[PDB]
Design a protein around this ligand. Structure first.
Ligand SMILES: [Cu+2]
Ligand SMILES: [Cu+2]
Ligand SMILES: [Cu+2]
Lengths: 187, 187
């Protein structure tokens, strides 16, 4: 069967970090659900792009489990993810079932908020490093994409393609990732 | 005053090629209007991301002139742009007033449809080359971004950051482009 991705979309999400992985994952034949944290209403992203989610998180959570849960960045978006009890539950369940969690930019700070994957080597946006490292619960990396088992992290809008292709490789393999990559005109 | 950008959004537009330039231009302090070709209703992009435009093209056209008109790609999006009388009028006026026109991926084929910038050196997505070159009205380039005077073109999702930063440099200069570039974590 096809793999399934849940992308959690909150007000203030970085729209490039949301759209690039959604699009690339769909190119890879992954069934992606864009789930609105606050409900099924349009979401105003960090640079004012307005995205209509496929479903509310409340509804999407009922259609699990997912092979990857994806957390976009954006400072304010990540803060919303970090404050959400629903997100905490989803990430705990995903970690418990040994499913992939992928977070980019400020997104990984939601892992810290929900005590997910402590001990992992992680990266974040440079400006989110101090927040992520509060308490020393992770080991920091400057790699553009970092993967430590089932915790996959990345740095910013400019690493979003690498991040998305790493998700594709983890779910559908190296060959599919290479096939999806070529028409993008990367490098 | 601030520079102004019109981004024309049609069904089937490549969402990465729409969102990356909108976001990057807004980071550069450009006033960007995302205008829906078909009206103010949500637009279903090529990989099913749904974007709510800021205004209909019909309304946005009345708020000109713009310092750049931006045409995203996506095969079906570009076909819609190519078939639009409103787009033809907008591009003709922009060319006539010596304003920048920027098109990415399949987007430049709309320039061909509306007889804009003939003689220019241009690039497109590799799969859109034959369409763009029908009749030999342009000279083709494999550069990731090509700028020939006021006609700025680029190749695909993976060149969208370069394309957007080239627009920023053209409008707001090299220093602003460099300032906007650094927090993106490109390369
Ligand atoms: Cu970011
Ligand atoms: Cu919408
Ligand atoms: Cu394209």
């Amino acid at each position: 069967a096809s793999k399934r991705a849940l992308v959690i979309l909150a007000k203030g999400a970085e729209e490039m970090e949301t759209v690039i992985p959604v699009d690339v994952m769909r190119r890879a034949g992954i069934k992606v659900t864009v789930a609105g944290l606050a409900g099924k209403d349009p979401v105003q992203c960090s640079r004012d792009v307005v995205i209509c989610p496929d479903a509310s998180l409340e509804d999407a959570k009922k259609e699990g489990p997912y092979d990857v849960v994806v957390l976009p960045g954006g400072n304010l978006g990540a803060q919303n993810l970090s404050e959400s009890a629903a997100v905490k539950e989803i990430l705990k369940e995903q970690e418990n079932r040994k499913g992939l969690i992928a977070a980019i930019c400020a997104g990984p700070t939601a892992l810290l908020a929900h005590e997910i994957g402590f001990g992992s080597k992680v990266t974040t946006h440079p400006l989110a490093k101090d927040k992520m490292m509060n308490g020393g619960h992770y080991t920091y990396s400057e790699n553009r994409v970092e993967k430590d088992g089932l915790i996959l992290t990345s740095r910013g809008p400019g690493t979003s393609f690498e991040f998305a292709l790493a998700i594709v490789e983890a779910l559908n393999g190296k060959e599919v990732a290479a096939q999806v990559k070529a028409p993008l005109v990367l490098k």
